[PDB]
Amino acid sequence: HGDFRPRLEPCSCCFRTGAIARVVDGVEGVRLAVREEIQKGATQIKIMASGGVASPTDPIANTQYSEDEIRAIVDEAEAANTYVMAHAYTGRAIARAVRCGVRTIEHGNLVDEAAAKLMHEHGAFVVPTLVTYDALAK
Amino acid sequence: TITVLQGGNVLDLERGVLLEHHHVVIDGERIVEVTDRPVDLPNAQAIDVRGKTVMPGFIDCHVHVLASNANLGVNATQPNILAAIRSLPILDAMLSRGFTSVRDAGGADWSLMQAVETGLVSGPRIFPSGKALSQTGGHGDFRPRLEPCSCCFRTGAIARVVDGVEGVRLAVREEIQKGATQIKIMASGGVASPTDPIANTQYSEDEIRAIVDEAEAANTYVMAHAYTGRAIARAVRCGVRTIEHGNLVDEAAAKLMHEHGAFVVPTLVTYDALAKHGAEFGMPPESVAKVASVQQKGRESLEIYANAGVKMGFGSDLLGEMHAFQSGEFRIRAEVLGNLEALRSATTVAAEIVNMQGQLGVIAVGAIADLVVLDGNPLEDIGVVADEGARVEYVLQRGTLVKRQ
Amino acid sequence: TITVLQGGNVLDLERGVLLEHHHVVIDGERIVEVTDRPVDLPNAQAIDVRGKTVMPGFIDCHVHVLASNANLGVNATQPNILAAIRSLPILDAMLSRGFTSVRDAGGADWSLMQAVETGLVSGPRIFPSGKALSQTGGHGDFRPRLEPCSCCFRTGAIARVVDGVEGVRLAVREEIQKGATQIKIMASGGVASPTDPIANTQYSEDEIRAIVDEAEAANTYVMAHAYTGRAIARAVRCGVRTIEHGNLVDEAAAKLMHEHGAFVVPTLVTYDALAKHGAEFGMPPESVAKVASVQQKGRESLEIYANAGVKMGFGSDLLGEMHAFQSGEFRIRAEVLGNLEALRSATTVAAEIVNMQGQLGVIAVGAIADLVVLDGNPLEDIGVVADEGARVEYVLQRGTLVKRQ
Amino acid sequence: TITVLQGGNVLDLERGVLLEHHHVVIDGERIVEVTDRPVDLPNAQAIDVRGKTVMPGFIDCHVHVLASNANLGVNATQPNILAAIRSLPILDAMLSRGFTSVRDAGGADWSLMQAVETGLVSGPRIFPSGKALSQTGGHGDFRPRGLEPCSCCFRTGAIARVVDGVEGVRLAVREEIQKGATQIKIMASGGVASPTDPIANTQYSEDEIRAIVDEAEAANTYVMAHAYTGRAIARAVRCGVRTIEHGNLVDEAAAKLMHEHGAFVVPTLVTYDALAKHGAEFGMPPESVAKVASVQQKGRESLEIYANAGVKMGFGSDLLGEMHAFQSGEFRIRAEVLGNLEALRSATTVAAEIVNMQGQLGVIAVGAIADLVVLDGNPLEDIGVVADEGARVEYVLQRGTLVKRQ
Ligand SMILES: [Zn+2]
Ligand SMILES: [Zn+2]
Ligand SMILES: [Zn+2]
Ligand SMILES: [Zn+2]
Ligand SMILES: [Zn+2]
Ligand SMILES: [Zn+2]
Ligand SMILES: [Zn+2]
């Protein structure tokens, strides 16, 4: 959901201040990236854990990151006494993310009650963002 | 507007009969009516299909559209534009043979699939794998027996070499970003590659599992090249959906396959072709050495699969000028299982493999209008489909008529 | 075997007259006889050409065969196999307009050349430049106004970016290894690039001299893109042999060009097309700001060149769907210099540019059978050529007949 | 629409006289009339400038807009988005003092230029250099005497980049021009604000400099060059650099050579006074303030040498950090040696020539761009009406529109 490359590859050495996301894969890759972000003084960690609307190549129904990666990220955030926030639409995408230990779910427009129940139980929060969809409608 | 195939004998595959003098009505790209009514045609393109079999367009679940010559090593090193050009005839010939859809097993990309869909290029609908994943020294590694590798994708390479869990994870995420519809791996040694004996397994289980997971994360599946029962069993246990070739199964592995709900796509016709014109068409001499063994159990494997109840899809896997023999696989399969089965393999079972059950491989209301009009009855003579081409005189694709023969 | 175009009016260009009812005799790929003899036809393919002009195939000295859309930036970034596919119509159309040879000004390679020569693909013989050389921020640099840089050659890319004496030396050596027939460089600001104003020069004299040398070492020459008299003069003084566009010469630069024996290839049609459909066909707004100025002196320059006695070749340089207007350059030139000269630019002078003196661009004994058959006389009505292919009904290429219209 | 400054005393600079009660009529972004012919347009938008001097807006030929603190080492290492933010008050303040154009001498890029031109940000028009070119250990190289690691990407707070070698510089110039520099800045000498280079010695080979000049000329611009001594100056000019920065230690030999080649100078005397008082105080390293003692001596003196050899002089300040406030003081310093006509010429007619905008800026004439300052008093007799930190300028107009009311 953060990869804005159109449908060749090798990206990009260094960070543009206009960039929302960075692209990192792999357990050691994410682990580092979280440590880098916390060093640079983030207060919490955002990940994309499902497809979205604003990115070119990902349909919304599919999931992002392995459970190993997400678990590594949640651990590195907890290690710095903070939490992970996670962008995620479907109940399938939410449920996994929550059980990997993420604390807040962003958007969450397509929950079933099963995933909702799991959220409540784990004590995870949701941050709906309904207004953006009406604006992107018009 | 709107089209009617009138007076045909519509092949219904789940009941296993022709339905004579049934009309089929196409609106846009979809089939709207199948009936033996006198039908109410005002502004319909009538095409008269009296006493000729009309069946769903064929689906081939294992092609390499870009294999324009039998030495895959030298196929990879041909210049890009030239690799692309040489695939254009291959795509045309397939379509004229009745094949309105193909699953490409490494080579074709999303661009090629777009080129047929926008109509820039004549061919079957492509379901591209992107590039097959291969471990180092694997069935996709075409380096001879020193190697530093190679940081740019040649458009005529069938495969790419990637090792390790994060390596393969990233490669799948790449391939799906570039727009693969499914993921191909090499889970065993093969024939067309320099260094791997056929009995050996490829990729650890951690690698395969990682790959399967990334495919499922993008709501698709992994197809896996595998010969022996050992190489098949572990691939299926890791979660691969379709097995390619599969010539050396035991019934143990077939039972496991059936239990997991895994498909096979045998490609027997490629071994018969590689037998006759192997070293002749420029495939390296020690690769034709390996081709002797797999074709033996080839027909025998078909029986094991049917006995275990494992669904079987149609596949050629022909390379280079041997691409002509594509339709002969129908015969090969009809000789072992009934020619009802042979036709089912390329239609209903196929459509399921590519997740288009109800969309392709069946003449029914709501389905896509990918039709073949056939001079004769395939249900009694398999030769009407299995003769290089010959006896197919209409090919319809997504509503429109693309071949008149 | 053997072919006769009988009873045509053969255009002889150095005398400037039609030769009525002269038969032309083709054996293999070569012209064997040109005569008004009743000719001794036993087994020849007679094609009747009574009352129709037969002239050499046209040679366009500046095309971009791969420029399939007007934004050369986005052209570069389109997928490889698509870039290749999309050039096929472009090549086909050029030929059917009567162009049997093109010199490609960056984009096309040896593989494309081969595709047409082996007859895998329809179109003109190509004299490929490989990739246009361009300094950073130069006319072939398509990055917008803090830049990371790439390392693999996209097949839609017109240019590559190389700087430094050694860098350009290596680049020339590389291009010729890959099979370039001549070397293209950008020696000045242009129109189709984002960051360079047209008035300024590109590459040091050191870099250009090195490039020319590496060219000459492979017994070929350099073609140079250049507008103003200042940018031109220094390129000629470094020893570049052809000068592309050249819209803003003064007579001091023209005189020098004459003195050194340097050609020009103006490309006037492309500015008229970019005038009408510039921002309309997807070329960036600040590039069409730059197209206003160069077309002004465009026609005027031809007179300057003619006056100082500088040999002029035919060039279109059209991009994207504007490729159709190719023949229109005949009109534009015929309106300023006679339509003799206009025809000379695409035949006798053109062949000299590509070093095929006596091989192409002349109907004579021993020359290559690249013929156009024309319904009308171009020596009086230039429109019989300059009408997008309307009045050309036969195109012969290396002996064989390729267009019947 | 249309604007009139009415009844102003229009400074004409080539004659050196006020023209009292002349009206100046702006249409769009251009000046269309300077006259005393009563103007008849009610549709206009008018501003009463009775008994007030209206002159062209000032141009400063040497600033570092991004130098938000006096330690250029630590300026380079500040986070990007902060580096940007902190330059906004600097820009806004320069504009209020009457500077409507500035030539940035490394730091500011094309993005900043755009930000003011599209009006996203308040400040003078910028003529960006991008980044100053410097050799290793050069006036641009802020690495301590170690060492030799490091550096990947361009920090937006960095004044310079280090590049060495003929091809290296050639490529760097092309890069800088592609990124949208209007001219090229190089260090051709030791300096004051860098750790390792004593001011006496020269920087860059003649091959390097001459390659730099060529690439700049190929892009129809010029090279500006930082140099102190007559030795360092002469060779720079021999290699074809068009303007020389600072130049505090000329001999009349170099000056004469400068006049001959048509090369300009931009002294920046004010910065050395500021670094004298508040040098080590505002956080510039203790051995950089050791170097500042010497250059200010010959500073005032050099002005006379330049005048004598007839070498054109442009206004420059080159202030760092909070010392940015002293910008206008450079007028008084220059007035005290050469006439205050000359002081005003340096920031107008001469400056606009330096930035190749002769006739476009620095002159109130028909067809020129409407960059105007309205001044309470007459600078031709009291230089303090300009040299007193924004005190006596109550109107600033930029490309037609009014941007400061004070
Ligand atoms: Zn989000
Ligand atoms: Zn295979
Ligand atoms: Zn295969
Ligand atoms: Zn050009
Ligand atoms: Zn061109
Ligand atoms: Zn300086
Ligand atoms: Zn400075």
Side-chain angles (χ1 to χ4, degrees), chain B residues 62-64 105 139 158 184 225 245 317:
Chain B
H62 198 112
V63 301
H64 304 267
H139 187 44
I158 286 325
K184 165 86 184 258
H225 161 104
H245 316 291
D317 204 31

Side-chain angles (χ1 to χ4, degrees), chain A residues 14-16, chain C residues 146-147, chain D residues 76 80 131 151-158 160-163 172 175-176 179:
Chain A
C14 70
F15 295 132
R16 327 268 307 113
Chain C
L146 323 136
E147 350 78 304
Chain D
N80 276 351
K131 319 209 102 60
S151 52
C152 357
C153 303
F154 292 136
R155 327 274 303 114
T156 47
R161 51 185 302 190
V162 188
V163 271
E175 285 166 353
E176 282 318 314
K179 291 185 221 149

Side-chain angles (χ1 to χ4, degrees), chain B residues 316-328:
Chain B
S316 329
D317 204 31
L318 297 156
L319 318 169
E321 35 273 290
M322 290 171 271
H323 252 91
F325 302 114
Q326 184 185 11
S327 303

Side-chain angles (χ1 to χ4, degrees), chain B residues 250-284:
Chain B
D250 41 61
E251 56 265 77
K255 190 186 262 279
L256 193 70
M257 249 179 300
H258 167 64
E259 251 161 313
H260 281 80
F263 302 85
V264 218
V265 175
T267 56
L268 309 185
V269 71
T270 204
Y271 306 106
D272 288 3
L274 281 173
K276 240 97 60 112
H277 327 283
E280 183 197 299
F281 279 147
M283 191 193 57

